[PDB]
Swiss-Prot record, chains A, B:
The chain holds residues 215 to 268 of 740 of the full protein. It comes from the Eukaryota. PH domain binds phospholipids including phosphatidic acid, phosphatidylinositol 3-phosphate, phosphatidylinositol 3,5-bisphosphate (PIP2) and phosphatidylinositol 3,4,5-trisphosphate (PIP3). May mediate ACAP1-binding to PIP2 or PIP3 containing membranes. Only one PH domain of one ACAP1 dimer inserts into the membrane, while the other PH domain acts primaryly to interact with adjacent ACAP1 dimers. The BAR domain mediates homodimerization, it can neither bind membrane nor impart curvature, but instead requires the neighboring PH domain to achieve these functions. Banana-shaped homodimer laterally assembling into tetramers, the tetramers further pack helically onto the membrane. Interacts with GTP-bound ARF6. Interacts with third cytoplasmic loop of SLC2A4/GLUT4. Interacts with CLTC. Interacts with GULP1. Forms a complex with GDP-bound ARF6 and GULP1. Interacts with ITGB1; required for ITGB1 recycling. Highest level in lung and spleen. Low level in heart, kidney, liver and pancreas. It is found in: Recycling endosome membrane. It comes from Homo sapiens (Human). This is Arf-GAP with coiled-coil, ANK repeat and PH domain-containing protein 1. Cells overexpressing ACAP1 show an accumulation of ITGB1 in recycling endosomes and inhibition of stimulation-dependent cell migration. Cells with reduced levels of ACAP1 or AKT1 and AKT2 show inhibition of stimulation-dependent cell migration. Cells overexpressing ACAP1 and PIP5K1C show formation of tubular structures derived from endosomal membranes. The lineage of its organism: Eukaryota, Metazoa, Chordata, Craniata, Vertebrata.
């Protein structure tokens, strides 16, 4: 009884995960193709606690 | 004089190409992410010369 109760929760969790990670895959192949930058990281100048943070 | 003349056609051909392999690359990651199927190849039963071809 514990075994079928758990298993049936388990099937939904790994189906949920298969959908979840396949969407991540659809965004990553999309990032790589369209938004993948070649330049170095760039610091960001802003206002902050007792003057500007960078 | 031959060098610089040829070099102008040479660069344009590889600018043309540099686009070219970017289009193949651009379709191939669209194909790979979204339409890439795991089922086995299936023949096509279509009429040909002499009767049915598959």
């Amino acid at each position: 009884q514990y075994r079928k109760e758990l298993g049936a929760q388990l099937h939904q969790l790994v189906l949920n995960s298969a959908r979840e990670k396949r969407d991540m895959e659809q965004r990553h192949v999309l990032l790589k193709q369209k938004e993948l930058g070649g330049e170095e990281p760039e610091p960001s100048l802003r206002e902050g606690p007792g003057g500007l943070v960078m």
